[PDB]
Design an enzyme around this catalytic site. Structure first.
Site, PDB file in Angstrom:
ATOM      1  CB  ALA A 117      42.959 -54.690 -44.708  1.00 23.33           C
ATOM      2  CE1 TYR A 118      45.724 -49.778 -38.874  1.00 19.67           C
ATOM      3  CE2 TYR A 118      46.713 -50.212 -41.003  1.00 19.67           C
ATOM      4  CZ  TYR A 118      46.423 -49.338 -39.977  1.00 19.67           C
ATOM      5  OH  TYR A 118      46.844 -48.031 -40.061  1.00 19.67           O
ATOM      6  N   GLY A 119      42.387 -51.304 -40.297  1.00 19.76           N
ATOM      7  CA  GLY A 119      41.740 -50.183 -39.612  1.00 19.76           C
ATOM      8  C   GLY A 119      42.429 -48.884 -39.928  1.00 19.76           C
ATOM      9  CG  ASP A 142      54.223 -60.935 -41.800  1.00 22.28           C
ATOM     10  OD1 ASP A 142      54.837 -61.208 -42.866  1.00 22.28           O
ATOM     11  OD2 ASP A 142      53.264 -60.164 -41.741  1.00 22.28           O
TER      12      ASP A 142
HETATM   13  C1  LIG Z   1      49.016 -53.852 -39.653  1.00 15.98           C
HETATM   14  C2  LIG Z   1      49.492 -53.649 -38.213  1.00 15.98           C
HETATM   15  C3  LIG Z   1      48.429 -54.063 -37.195  1.00 15.98           C
HETATM   16  O1  LIG Z   1      47.985 -53.280 -36.356  1.00 15.98           O
HETATM   17  N1  LIG Z   1      48.043 -55.332 -37.289  1.00 15.98           N
HETATM   18  C4  LIG Z   1      46.951 -55.926 -36.524  1.00 15.98           C
HETATM   19  C5  LIG Z   1      47.457 -57.164 -35.781  1.00 15.98           C
HETATM   20  O2  LIG Z   1      48.001 -58.109 -36.697  1.00 15.98           O
HETATM   21  C6  LIG Z   1      45.782 -56.302 -37.414  1.00 15.98           C
HETATM   22  C7  LIG Z   1      44.495 -56.445 -36.928  1.00 15.98           C
HETATM   23  C8  LIG Z   1      43.484 -56.811 -37.792  1.00 15.98           C
HETATM   24  C9  LIG Z   1      43.785 -57.026 -39.107  1.00 15.98           C
HETATM   25  C10 LIG Z   1      45.108 -56.873 -39.546  1.00 15.98           C
HETATM   26  N2  LIG Z   1      45.505 -57.066 -40.840  1.00 15.98           N
HETATM   27  C11 LIG Z   1      44.559 -57.067 -41.962  1.00 15.98           C
HETATM   28  C12 LIG Z   1      45.015 -58.021 -43.047  1.00 15.98           C
HETATM   29  N3  LIG Z   1      46.396 -57.668 -43.486  1.00 15.98           N
HETATM   30  C13 LIG Z   1      46.845 -58.522 -44.619  1.00 15.98           C
HETATM   31  C14 LIG Z   1      47.334 -57.760 -42.327  1.00 15.98           C
HETATM   32  C15 LIG Z   1      46.889 -56.801 -41.244  1.00 15.98           C
HETATM   33  N4  LIG Z   1      46.093 -56.522 -38.691  1.00 15.98           N
HETATM   34  N5  LIG Z   1      49.934 -52.282 -37.988  1.00 15.98           N
HETATM   35  C16 LIG Z   1      49.239 -51.124 -38.543  1.00 15.98           C
HETATM   36  C17 LIG Z   1      50.009 -49.988 -37.940  1.00 15.98           C
HETATM   37  C18 LIG Z   1      49.929 -48.634 -38.165  1.00 15.98           C
HETATM   38  C19 LIG Z   1      50.776 -47.771 -37.506  1.00 15.98           C
HETATM   39  C20 LIG Z   1      51.728 -48.247 -36.607  1.00 15.98           C
HETATM   40  C21 LIG Z   1      52.579 -47.272 -35.872  1.00 15.98           C
HETATM   41  N6  LIG Z   1      53.003 -46.251 -36.605  1.00 15.98           N
HETATM   42  C22 LIG Z   1      53.735 -45.285 -35.991  1.00 15.98           C
HETATM   43  N7  LIG Z   1      54.192 -44.277 -36.750  1.00 15.98           N
HETATM   44  C23 LIG Z   1      54.072 -44.183 -38.188  1.00 15.98           C
HETATM   45  C24 LIG Z   1      54.291 -42.755 -38.686  1.00 15.98           C
HETATM   46  C25 LIG Z   1      54.342 -42.722 -40.204  1.00 15.98           C
HETATM   47  O3  LIG Z   1      55.372 -43.586 -40.714  1.00 15.98           O
HETATM   48  C26 LIG Z   1      55.086 -44.947 -40.358  1.00 15.98           C
HETATM   49  C27 LIG Z   1      55.070 -45.128 -38.853  1.00 15.98           C
HETATM   50  N8  LIG Z   1      54.069 -45.270 -34.683  1.00 15.98           N
HETATM   51  C28 LIG Z   1      53.599 -46.262 -33.941  1.00 15.98           C
HETATM   52  C29 LIG Z   1      52.850 -47.291 -34.497  1.00 15.98           C
HETATM   53 CL1  LIG Z   1      52.278 -48.557 -33.462  1.00 15.98          CL
HETATM   54  C30 LIG Z   1      51.797 -49.630 -36.372  1.00 15.98           C
HETATM   55  C31 LIG Z   1      50.948 -50.482 -37.051  1.00 15.98           C
HETATM   56  C32 LIG Z   1      50.810 -51.956 -37.007  1.00 15.98           C
HETATM   57  O4  LIG Z   1      51.351 -52.760 -36.256  1.00 15.98           O
END
Ligand SMILES: C[C@H](C(=O)N[C@H](CO)c1cccc(N2CCN(C)CC2)n1)N1Cc2ccc(-c3nc(NC4CCOCC4)ncc3Cl)cc2C1=O
Length: 346
Positions: free
Chosen positions: A25-27, A139
């Site tokens: 959902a985030y993108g 969280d």
């Molecule tokens: C949700 C949260 C996020 O970006 N959240 C933002 C602010 O809260 C956001 C914005 C608007 C809405 C929303 N929602 C919607 C409603 N939902 C209930 C909650 C989230 N969330 N994520 C997504 C995300 C994807 C990848 C990584 C990441 N992955 C790797 N490698 C992989 C390799 C394969 O194995 C797993 C690791 N390396 C570095 C990084 Cl940085 C980090 C994040 C993170 O933090």
């Protein structure tokens, strides 16, 4: 404009060679080669602007992560967006690329006791810094703990993070709550808005329990079932702890339940290190006032191989939002996101 799984991912000229990682959902998130630092990075494309709650998450993440600098907290390396607010529909956040996360690891791998100890140490080390900034993550869960190939750990997703506010923590019984159900402290369901540091300690306790067995300790299927899972293991709260819950609806709910004794940790976790179970007991204390704090947890015998307070840094000052974000319109939050991301424009 490069495309990934039928979506524009326009991050050039600095970032090339995009490979899909995932979405939600985030993108969407890709790895990309960074042509300036010469290393592959993670880039997440967030498109939050039609949703007030997504704008709030985006802005909290950006403001906090740009102020924080800690080895156990994911950084923001760069933010790409359009040069004008009118043309900005997406924000791309560039972060260090990690191999995996603890949710994926617990579904697929047995953790050695040494791995559990080291992971718990790094979680508590990063959390010491967060709490020292008077911030609550709010969280913490396995999917918000990223890991690299040498098991270095970084806390991510500060979209629900806020400044601690113990004076306004009281609420009524069954007050609705946003953060992930399985990791919610019992007091959330009884009398707490989750505005104190003790909320995070509970989540870390839940994470420790999950590392011990590869299964969530309190997998509640709905709001009140979460409390009933907790009480199933902890047992009935003591008279002192119950008398701390002054709201009658919450107190009388607790009094209505049949007596249940504590399930010993060594029955749930027969292979666990005894010192790990002692720390677990202190993190999963019913009464948040008696719950261990982050700096005490680091000092616990279980972590003695790692504990070094001179190498467990704190923030240089308390974190403050300029204004309360909770109720601002999405159009205003967009403005704020625009301003917060200005320093990455060339
Ligand atoms: C949700 C949260 C996020 O970006 N959240 C933002 C602010 O809260 C956001 C914005 C608007 C809405 C929303 N929602 C919607 C409603 N939902 C209930 C909650 C989230 N969330 N994520 C997504 C995300 C994807 C990848 C990584 C990441 N992955 C790797 N490698 C992989 C390799 C394969 O194995 C797993 C690791 N390396 C570095 C990084 Cl940085 C980090 C994040 C993170 O933090």
């Amino acid at each position: 404009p490069e495309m990934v799984r039928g979506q524009v991912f326009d991050v050039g000229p600095r970032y090339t060679n995009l490979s899909y990682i995932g979405e939600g959902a985030y993108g969407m998130v890709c790895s990309a080669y960074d042509n300036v630092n010469k290393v592959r990075v993670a880039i997440k494309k967030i498109s939050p602007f039609e949703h007030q709650t997504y704008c709030q998450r985006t802005l909290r993440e950006i403001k906090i992560l740009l102020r924080f600098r800690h080895e156990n907290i994911i950084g923001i390396n760069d933010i790409i967006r359009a040069p004008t607010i009118e043309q900005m529909k997406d924000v791309y956040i560039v972060q260090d690329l990690m191999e995996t996360d603890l949710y994926k690891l617990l579904k697929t791998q047995h953790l050695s006791n040494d791995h559990i100890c080291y992971f718990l140490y790094q979680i508590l080390r990063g959390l010491k810094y967060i709490h020292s900034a008077n911030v609550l993550h709010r969280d913490l869960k396995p999917s918000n703990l990223l890991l690299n190939t040498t098991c270095d750990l970084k806390i991510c997703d500060f979209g629900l993070a806020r400044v601690a506010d113990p004076d306004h923590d009281h609420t009524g019984f069954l007050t609705e709550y946003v953060a992930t159900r399985w990791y919610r402290a019992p007091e959330i369901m009884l009398n707490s808005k989750g505005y104190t540091k003790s909320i995070d300690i509970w989540s870390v306790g839940c994470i420790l329990a999950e590392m011990l067995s590869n299964r969530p300790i309190f997998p509640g299927k709905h709001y009140l079932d979460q409390l009933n899972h907790i009480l199933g293991i902890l047992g009935s709260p003591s008279q002192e702890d119950l008398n701390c819950i002054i709201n009658l609806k919450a107190r009388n709910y607790l009094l209505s339940l049949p007596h249940k004794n504590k399930v010993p940790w060594n029955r749930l976790f027969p292979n666990a290190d005894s010192k790990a179970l002692d720390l677990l007991d202190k993190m999963l204390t019913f009464n948040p006032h008696k719950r261990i704090e982050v700096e005490q947890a680091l000092a616990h015998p279980y972590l003695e191989q790692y504990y070094d307070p001179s190498d467990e840094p704190i923030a240089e000052a308390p974190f403050k939002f300029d204004m309360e974000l909770d109720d601002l319109p999405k159009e205003k939050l967009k403005e704020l996101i625009f301003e917060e991301t200005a320093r990455f424009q060339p």
